Amino acid sequence: SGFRKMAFPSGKVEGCMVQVTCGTTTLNGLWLDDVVYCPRHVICTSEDMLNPNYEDLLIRKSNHNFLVQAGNVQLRVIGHSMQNCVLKLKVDTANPKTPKYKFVRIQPGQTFSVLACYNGSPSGVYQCAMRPNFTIKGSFLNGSCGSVGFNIDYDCVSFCYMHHMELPTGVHAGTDLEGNFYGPFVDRQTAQAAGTDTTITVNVLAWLYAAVINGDRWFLNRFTTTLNDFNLVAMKYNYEPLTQDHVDILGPLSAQTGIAVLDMCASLKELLQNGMNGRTILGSALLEDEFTPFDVVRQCSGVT
Amino acid sequence: SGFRKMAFPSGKVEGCMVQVTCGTTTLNGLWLDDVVYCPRHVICTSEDMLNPNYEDLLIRKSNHNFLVQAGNVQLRVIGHSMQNCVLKLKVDTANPKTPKYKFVRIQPGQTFSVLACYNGSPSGVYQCAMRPNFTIKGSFLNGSCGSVGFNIDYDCVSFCYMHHMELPTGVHAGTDLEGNFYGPFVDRQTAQAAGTDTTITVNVLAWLYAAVINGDRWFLNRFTTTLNDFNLVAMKYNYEPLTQDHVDILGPLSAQTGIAVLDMCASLKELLQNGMNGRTILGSALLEDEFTPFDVVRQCSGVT
Ligand SMILES: O=C(c1cc(=O)[nH]c2ccccc12)N1CCN(c2cccc(C(F)(F)F)c2)CC1
Ligand SMILES: O=C(c1cc(=O)[nH]c2ccccc12)N1CCN(c2cccc(C(F)(F)F)c2)CC1
Numbered sequence: 226s227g228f229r230k231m232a233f234p235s236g237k238v239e240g241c242m243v244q245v246t247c248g249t250t251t252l253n254g255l256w257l258d259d260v261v262y263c264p265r266h267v268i269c270t271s272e273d274m275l276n277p278n279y280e281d282l283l284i285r286k287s288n289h290n291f292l293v294q295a296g297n298v299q300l301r302v303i304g305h306s307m308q309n310c311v312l313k314l315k316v317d318t319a320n321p322k323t324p325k326y327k328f329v330r331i332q333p334g335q336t337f338s339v340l341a342c343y344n345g346s347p348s349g350v351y352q353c354a355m356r357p358n359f360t361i362k363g364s365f366l367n368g369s370c371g372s373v374g375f376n377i378d379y380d381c382v383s384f385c386y387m388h389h390m391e392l393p394t395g396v397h398a399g400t401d402l403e404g405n406f407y408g409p410f411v412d413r414q415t416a417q418a419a420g421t422d423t424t425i426t427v428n429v430l431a432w433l434y435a436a437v438i439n440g441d442r443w444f445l446n447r448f449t450t451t452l453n454d455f456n457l458v459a460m461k462y463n464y465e466p467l468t469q470d471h472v473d474i475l476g477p478l479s480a481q482t483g484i485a486v487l488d489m490c491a492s493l494k495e496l497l498q499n500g501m502n503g504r505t506i507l508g509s510a511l512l513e514d515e516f517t518p519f520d521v522v523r524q525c526s527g528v529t
Numbered sequence: 530s531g532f533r534k535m536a537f538p539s540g541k542v543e544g545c546m547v548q549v550t551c552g553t554t555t556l557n558g559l560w561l562d563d564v565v566y567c568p569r570h571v572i573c574t575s576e577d578m579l580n581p582n583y584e585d586l587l588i589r590k591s592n593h594n595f596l597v598q599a600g601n602v603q604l605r606v607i608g609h610s611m612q613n614c615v616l617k618l619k620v621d622t623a624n625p626k627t628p629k630y631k632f633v634r635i636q637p638g639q640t641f642s643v644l645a646c647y648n649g650s651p652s653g654v655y656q657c658a659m660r661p662n663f664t665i666k667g668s669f670l671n672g673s674c675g676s677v678g679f680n681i682d683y684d685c686v687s688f689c690y691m692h693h694m695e696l697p698t699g700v701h702a703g704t705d706l707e708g709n710f711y712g713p714f715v716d717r718q719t720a721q722a723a724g725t726d727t728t729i730t731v732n733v734l735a736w737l738y739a740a741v742i743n744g745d746r747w748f749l750n751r752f753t754t755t756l757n758d759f760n761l762v763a764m765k766y767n768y769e770p771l772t773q774d775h776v777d778i779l780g781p782l783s784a785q786t787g788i789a790v791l792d793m794c795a796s797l798k799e800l801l802q803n804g805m806n807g808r809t810i811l812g813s814a815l816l817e818d819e820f821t822p823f824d825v826v827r828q829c830s831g832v833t
Binding site: 226227228229230231232233234235236237239240340341342343344346347348349350351353362363364365366367368369391395396397439440500501503505508509510511523524525526527528529 | 539544809831
């Protein structure tokens with residue numbers, strides 16, 4: 226038993242972390258096969274930061290201006306291209322440590338592991354969720370750009386996130402591995418509206434199922450609700466609307482505990498309308514939405 | 530910016546995880562050099578579980594009864610010994626993936642990374658703290674025994690914890706890598722008093738320093754206190770007494786923020802006596818004690 230914010234083992238991804246230097250700027254790259262992927266703002270000076278013309282800036286750059294370093298060995302850049310907001314530097318050596326991988330675009334409410342890197346060196350790993358407003362509440366300092374988010378299915382690493390920037394609000398924005406930003410964000414040092422963030426209702430419910438499994442049952446009640454009634458409370462409290470798909474994905478946790486999904490929604494409804502009254506659920510004094518039903522299922526079943 | 534419960538990159542430790550089978554029991558082992566370390570209760574049947582005579586049980590076991598498997602390759606056990614509550618199985622092959630390592634005994638209040646394993650396979654990684662009552666609030670299911678806790682200084686992995694058992698209270702107990710249990714716990718399926726757990730006061734203060742650095746300053750006040758006055762509040766609220774050593778270790782965070790340590794104790798004193806009033810500090814509705822001053826310093830400075 227026990228419930229923790231668990232990240233995937235990061236080893237398969239530490240082997241792909243490299244340092245990318247272009248001019249006086251240094252950030253992290255992702256070396257898979259003979260390609261190193263990195264944020265295209267690596268070619269930025271502090272003058273053009275406000276609104277860069279990346280095509281023109283890249284045109285002044287040649288293979289030999291990108292310096293790719295893996296720990297201590299220099300990689301030979303034989304090609305360079307821009308794919309949306311990422312650079313794909315072609316190198317003459319395939320990464321011997323390349324795992325089985327896919328590049329995937331995750332959906333809001335989905336969770337992934339982040340490997341924070343500085344100078345191509347992994348410094349830590351944490352689990353986070355893509356907020357419905359397409360931001361992540363991560364932990365990143367100067368030099369963290371190019372740090373990736375991923376999931377791991379047995380031996381296959383699905384890369385979903387590349388770190389690009391921090392919004393003035395302290396939240397983080399980045400792209401998928403094809404350079405497509407999650408959200409309306411652009412790689413410009415300009416004021417960007419983060420957007421209204423809602424709570425991932427299916428995930429809070431999944432985390433309530435983990436609480437029942439792990440001993441915490443104080444919040445459980447004699448009440449029930451309908452999807453329509455519950456959603457009125459979710460709208461009031463800026464929670465994501467609960468759909469029948471969400472009810473389906475919660476089927477396994479409903480079966481494991483014996484608590485019908487709408488009975489858990491009623492417990493959640495009361496927690497929203499009345500608060501925790503100074504009590505805790507799984508060691509927390511607030512409702513947690515960064516655990517998907519798959520995460521709770523995995524952490525309470527034991528998938529390696 | 531951003532504050533997350535960050536674990537160390539787990540790669541160096543995934544390379545040392547093996548499966549240890551003895552009879553019908555399977556748990557995890559730690560392969561460093563030509564030795565595999567594992568919990569000695571691997572030699573237990575379900576009859577002797579209540580009070581095993583481990584010397585007698587080990588006497589009925591020979592090298593060939595311990596099955597060490599690393600992914601798919603079988604290791605040849607050429608020796609076996611009991612060191613406190615761990616078995617040291619000598620194998621004919623040195624682990625090619627052995628990192629620079631030390632075996633260290635951590636102190637209560639100290640934090641480490643755990644790599645949870647099932648069948649010698651890493652399934653996830655999380656950061657936790659050794660509670661003052663020498664327990665850890667981890668996340669472990671059947672087959673997790675032999676999962677280790679560690680810290681990483683640049684390239685050197687300091688192993689500090691080996692997972693052994695779950696107390697009926699849902700908290701976890703285990704040994705250092707020499708087999709010495711943290712706390713009064715014994716490797717017996719018997720009722721064991723967990724002990725009173727206090728809050729790691731220096732760590733909560735360090736986490737309050739991280740909050741100021743990361744933007745959260747609502748809790749800051751015009752008051753101050755003395756070490757003696759503050760400690761009266763800490764005693765009342767079951768917090769660890771704050772010593773002058775704790776004040777010294779907080780010197781760097783005090784210098785970074787400009788807030789004298791006793792001014793932060795006064796903010797903490799008010800939070801203890803008045804609560805958060807429904808507000809949050811670093812995304813949490815309770816005071817967090819699982820970040821040491823070194824962890825906050827590292828996460829707010831960027832050490833890789
Ligand atoms: O490493 C970081 C950074 C990331 C982060 O998430 N948090 C921080 C907190 C404090 C200081 C720096 C950071 N940088 C340097 C590169 N930066 C940059 C440069 C050129 C152009 C752009 C662009 F986004 F506008 F394209 C962006 C973005 C900020
Ligand atoms: O893998 C686990 C386990 C660990 C854990 O932390 N949480 C769990 C939650 C649900 C089910 C099992 C566990 N086991 C199996 C081996 N066990 C054992 C066997 C023989 C002797 C002993 C001894 F501690 F008494 F020595 C202990 C201890 C429990």
